[PDB]
Each structure stands twice: as structure tokens, then as C-alpha cells.
Amino acid sequence: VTEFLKPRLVDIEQVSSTHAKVTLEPLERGFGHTLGNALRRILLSSMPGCA
């Protein structure tokens, strides 16, 4: 009952340079949005750095 479809990055089609395109499958009928939204909101601000 706690067994889901554990996913994986099937490919990293890094298009050209300083640009990647990472596809992850398979997730549940609803987990693509929650992982996309979690990673999108964290990368946007939380991720530190210098400028």
C-alpha cells in the first residue's frame, strides 16, 4: 500500500551548452505537478549563490 512507481531520469538531453532538458518517468497520476512545482519553487529562490 506504500509501494508507488519509483521514477528515474531516463535521459538528460542537454541541448547545446548552459542548457539541459531532464525528463523523469514514471510518476503517479498527479506527482509530476508536485515535483515540478517543488523543484521549480526551490531552484527559483532557495538555491543560494553570489552576484
Binding site: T2, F4, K6, P7, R8, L9, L24, L27, F31, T34, L35, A38
Partner: protein
């Protein structure tokens, strides 16, 4: 299976309404901190701390994924291997390039009449065709 059973639909779902309300934090002297207050709505079958614990376990299990060809159908003889390497592979019933590519380097070293030199030859030839051992 008999005619006397009756099948109802199955809504295996204990919760009804989950509402979070973020708000400012003042307990810590440090400002720009937040409090997450989640009002759930259970039907009594699930403890709330058990619900938030299973939800965090499911999400951290989901982030475990990234946290800390017509050539295969060809016979092995078409690889231009040394007469020794080809005869050693045939002795292990490896007939096709697709069979060879599935074997690991550690498995090929167990085969009879298979030296370190013949293993290097097989790798160099597979690499020339864009193939690697252990696919």
C-alpha cells in the same frame, strides 16, 4: 464468483479537506520566518501526525530518484574478433552481439580460454561500434 456477492465501489480515502494557511512567525526573535498551519479533515480512520508522517515519507521517497537496433541482431563473428576470442564466446553460447552486450566484464573473465588480452580486444571492438559491455 457466486451470484450472491455484491460489489460496491471502494473509496479508500480517509481525508476530505486539507487546507494550509501560512502566517508570520514571532516565537523566534529572527524575523522573516513562517509558520505552516495545516487544518486537515479526517473521517476518524487516520491519526493526523501519522498522516503528515506518511505524506513526508512518500514525498521523500519520490525525491530518492535524484538525491544521494539492427546491429544487435548480427552474429559475433561479424565483430572481426581474433579466432581465440570468437571460439571462447561460442563455447559460452554467445551467438549474437545483443547477447555479448548484456554480459559484464566480470562474467566474461570467468569463461574458459578468456585472457585479459582477448577481453581488451572485445572492448575495443565494441567501443568502435558505440556498444559497451553490461547494457
Amino acid at each position: 464468483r457466486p451470484i450472491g456477492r455484491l460489489l460496491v465501489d471502494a473509496c479508500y480515502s480517509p481525508v476530505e479537506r486539507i487546507a494550509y494557511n501560512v502566517e508570520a512567525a514571532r516565537v523566534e526573535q529572527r524575523t522573516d520566518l513562517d509558520k505552516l498551519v495545516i487544518e486537515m479533515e479526517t473521517n476518524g480512520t487516520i491519526d493526523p501526525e501519522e498522516a503528515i508522517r506518511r505524506a513526508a515519507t512518500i514525498l521523500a521517497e519520490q525525491l530518492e530518484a535524484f538525491v544521494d537496433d539492427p546491429i544487435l541482431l548480427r552474429p559475433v563473428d561479424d565483430l572481426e574478433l581474433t579466432v581465440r576470442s570468437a571460439n571462447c564466446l561460442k563455447a559460452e553460447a554467445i551467438h549474437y552481439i545483443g547477447d555479448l552486450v548484456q554480459r559484464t566484464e566480470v562474467e566474461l573473465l570467468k569463461t574458459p580460454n578468456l585472457g585479459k588480452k582477448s577481453l581488451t580486444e572485445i572492448k575495443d571492438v565494441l567501443a568502435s561500434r558505440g556498444l559497451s559491455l553490461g547494457m
